[PDB]
Amino acid sequence: SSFVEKMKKTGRNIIVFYGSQTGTAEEFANRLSKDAHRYGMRGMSADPEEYDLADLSSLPEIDNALVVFCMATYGEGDPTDNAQDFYDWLQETDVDLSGVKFAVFGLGNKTYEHFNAMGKYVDKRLEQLGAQRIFELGLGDDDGNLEEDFITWREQFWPAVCEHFGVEATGEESSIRQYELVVHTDIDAAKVYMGEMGRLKSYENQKPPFDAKNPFLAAVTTNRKLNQGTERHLMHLELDISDSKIRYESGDHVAVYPANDSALVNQLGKILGADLDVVMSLNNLDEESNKKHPFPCPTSYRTALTYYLDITNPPRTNVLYELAQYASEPSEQELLRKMASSSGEGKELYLSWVVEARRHILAILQDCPSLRPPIDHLCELLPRLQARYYSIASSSKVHPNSVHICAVVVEYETKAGRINKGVATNWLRAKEPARALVPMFVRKSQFRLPFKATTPVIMVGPGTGVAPFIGFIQERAWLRQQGKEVGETLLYYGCRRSDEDYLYREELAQFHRDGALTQLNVAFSREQSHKVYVQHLLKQDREHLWKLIEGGAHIYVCGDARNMARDVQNTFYDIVAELGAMEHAQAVDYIKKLMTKGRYSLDVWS
Numbered sequence: 001s002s003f004v005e006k007m008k009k010t011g012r013n014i015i016v017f018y019g020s021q022t023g024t025a026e027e028f029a030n031r032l033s034k035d036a037h038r039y040g041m042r043g044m045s046a047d048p049e050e051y052d053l054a055d056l057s058s059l060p061e062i063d064n065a066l067v068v069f070c071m072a073t074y075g076e077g078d079p080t081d082n083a084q085d086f087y088d089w090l091q092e093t094d095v096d097l098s099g100v101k102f103a104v105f106g107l108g109n110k111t112y113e114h115f116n117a118m119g120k121y122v123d124k125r126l127e128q129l130g131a132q133r134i135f136e137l138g139l140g141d142d143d144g145n146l147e148e149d150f151i152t153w154r155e156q157f158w159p160a161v162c163e164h165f166g167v168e169a170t171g172e173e174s175s176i177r178q179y180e181l182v183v184h185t186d187i188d189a190a191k192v193y194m195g196e197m198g199r200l201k202s203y204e205n206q207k208p209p210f211d212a213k214n215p216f217l218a219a220v221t222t223n224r225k226l227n228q229g230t231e232r233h234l235m236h237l238e239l240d241i242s243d244s245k246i247r248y249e250s251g252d253h254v255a256v257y258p259a260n261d262s263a264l265v266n267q268l269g270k271i272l273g274a275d276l277d278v279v280m281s282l283n284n285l286d287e288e289s290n291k292k293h294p295f296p297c298p299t300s301y302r303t304a305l306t307y308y309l310d311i312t313n314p315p316r317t318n319v320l321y322e323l324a325q326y327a328s329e330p331s332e333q334e335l336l337r338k339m340a341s342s343s344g345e346g347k348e349l350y351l352s353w354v355v356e357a358r359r360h361i362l363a364i365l366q367d368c369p370s371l372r373p374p375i376d377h378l379c380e381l382l383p384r385l386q387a388r389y390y391s392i393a394s395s396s397k398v399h400p401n402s403v404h405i406c407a408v409v410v411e412y413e414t415k416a417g418r419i420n421k422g423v424a425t426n427w428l429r430a431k432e433p434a435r436a437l438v439p440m441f442v443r444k445s446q447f448r449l450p451f452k453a454t455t456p457v458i459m460v461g462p463g464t465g466v467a468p469f470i471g472f473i474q475e476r477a478w479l480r481q482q483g484k485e486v487g488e489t490l491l492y493y494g495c496r497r498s499d500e501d502y503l504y505r506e507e508l509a510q511f512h513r514d515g516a517l518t519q520l521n522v523a524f525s526r527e528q529s530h531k532v533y534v535q536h537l538l539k540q541d542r543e544h545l546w547k548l549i550e551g552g553a554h555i556y557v558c559g560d561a562r563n564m565a566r567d568v569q570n571t572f573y574d575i576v577a578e579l580g581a582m583e584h585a586q587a588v589d590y591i592k593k594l595m596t597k598g599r600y601s602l603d604v605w606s
């Protein structure tokens, strides 16, 4: 069906499409949608995947039509999966889009190579096609504060919409709920969702194919502490994927659906005076929408807060606003309402009291005790619980029936004096081997060993960034066993101290001894007065690396995307520049060209 038609039949004039993988763009597109009403308009949001964007040329059939795109960027400046189709259409079309009015707010991250490439492309492309831009491209940077970037952009978008179409601010800034509660006092267990995603009993009754809507419940066969310290916890997990038909290659990611901490869930129900065990269903008031429920329903509040809702990340400002109405104490309600301001003391207190203090929902309800919202409203405001991604640490050629994970457990004390715990890592940490099921699925990536086994590989991955390389080395050794010629295999690893967080020390030492690992160069950053990192070791090896590089070797960089990846790339620029005799700007082009040839791959996060 045509989305243009859908709009006509439902009285909508504004449509906001979201390109989203972890729900942020979606929630953004939703907030925009509910906003239409405050300016004499009717909006709806949509998943472009469910429609045909070629229908865009029919928008003029609706008076005052306005389309907005909230797009996030992924792997190498690529579109999220639900926008892939739209992308492909944008590239092969030359359709005349005169008369179409648009606005684009891109969700991206500066620490990545191709920053906000999706939004930039969509925005640049609609114009080339003939459409009319009504408001500047929004560049949301998640390395800074995406939320503020977004509210700053919205605050300027609406006025520009008002001006252009000749509409006005009703000022009816009141509150509206998307869903209505329905208690299920009389229900069977076979009818109640218990944390599974997609269809009911999908966890209990496992049938392929397994994906993000149908996760395969893998058994934890191994789960061992990797480091000797006790200040931190680094672990190696082995999830048994036998009988799942699931396939993967070293370089691919493994995603998992965690559960929130039991206690935190109880502290929540207890402070809200809510019987967490009540089964219920929240139903969408707009009987036209596909999204009938904010999460699988019916289901108990307990199940909802443990498996479907994010209760740990600092809430976005729109969530702090709606809650403000359930705070009786004047000064406590003052605080919460103000934090929604774009700037002034509102942005200040928001960034400081919420974000920097890393205050989760329970922390808020705690430091503003007069605040007492109903639990069902909260369930509609909170974001969905996302799966977490990990770089598979196994080679499917050695471990076809197992998927390995190397992770560091997140736990830190906040300025608010609280102890915060990462959701998936603590959860994975409590899974006992030899009972203990992890819901997971494999996501393909372009991170891959060279096509030819003889091509040399330069791997750089300190800390948990060593994960995909453990698989690479396993595979490379296995390739030598199959009696094939294997090029040089170098791993530039790093950690703080050799007697603390040296991950896989034995396994890596054995590999080098067996000859599979051509070289093992490790940088201990805290064993001497000053810092010693991987980019230092790369510098010292300037000669051999230039040789391998000019020879056609493949470079791989995995781990921290904030500083490490950037410093390592600057070191590689310096190598090419100093030894290629060319200029630094030329070295930069050189390294960028390698990325496009598939010979300089990145697997970084933060």
Ligand SMILES: Cc1cc2nc3c(=O)[nH]c(=O)nc-3n(C[C@H](O)[C@H](O)[C@H](O)COP(=O)(O)OP(=O)(O)OC[C@H]3O[C@@H](n4cnc5c(N)ncnc54)[C@H](O)[C@@H]3O)c2cc1C
Pocket (backbone or CB within 6 Å): 253, 312, 358, 388, 389, 390, 391, 392, 406, 407, 408, 409, 410, 411, 412, 421, 422, 423, 424, 425, 426, 464, 467, 604, 605, 606
């Ligand atoms: C593609 C990809 C590959 C990845 N590969 C791996 C991997 O192989 N191994 C691995 O360990 N991780 C990897 N991750 C990260 C992983 O997916 C999770 O983000 C990480 O394990 C934390 O998840 P969590 O649920 O335990 O923490 P969450 O509950 O999600 O909280 C995480 C957030 O806590 C905050 N935080 C952490 N430390 C502090 C601090 N001390 N002070 C203030 N804030 C802090 C940060 O905002 C951090 O983003 C990867 C991520 C991606 C996207």
Ligand SMILES: Cc1cc2nc3c(=O)[nH]c(=O)nc-3n(C[C@H](O)[C@H](O)[C@H](O)COP(=O)(O)O)c2cc1C
Pocket (backbone or CB within 6 Å): 019, 020, 021, 022, 023, 024, 025, 026, 072, 073, 074, 075, 076, 077, 078, 080, 107, 108, 109, 110, 112, 113, 114, 115, 116, 117, 142, 146
């Ligand atoms: C695996 C991965 C790859 C990413 N790649 C990019 C990228 O190439 N460019 C960019 O600007 N942002 C990149 N980001 C950041 C996201 O665009 C940003 O976090 C966005 O807020 C996610 O929105 P969503 O929840 O609506 O999908 C990446 C994030 C992840 C997790």
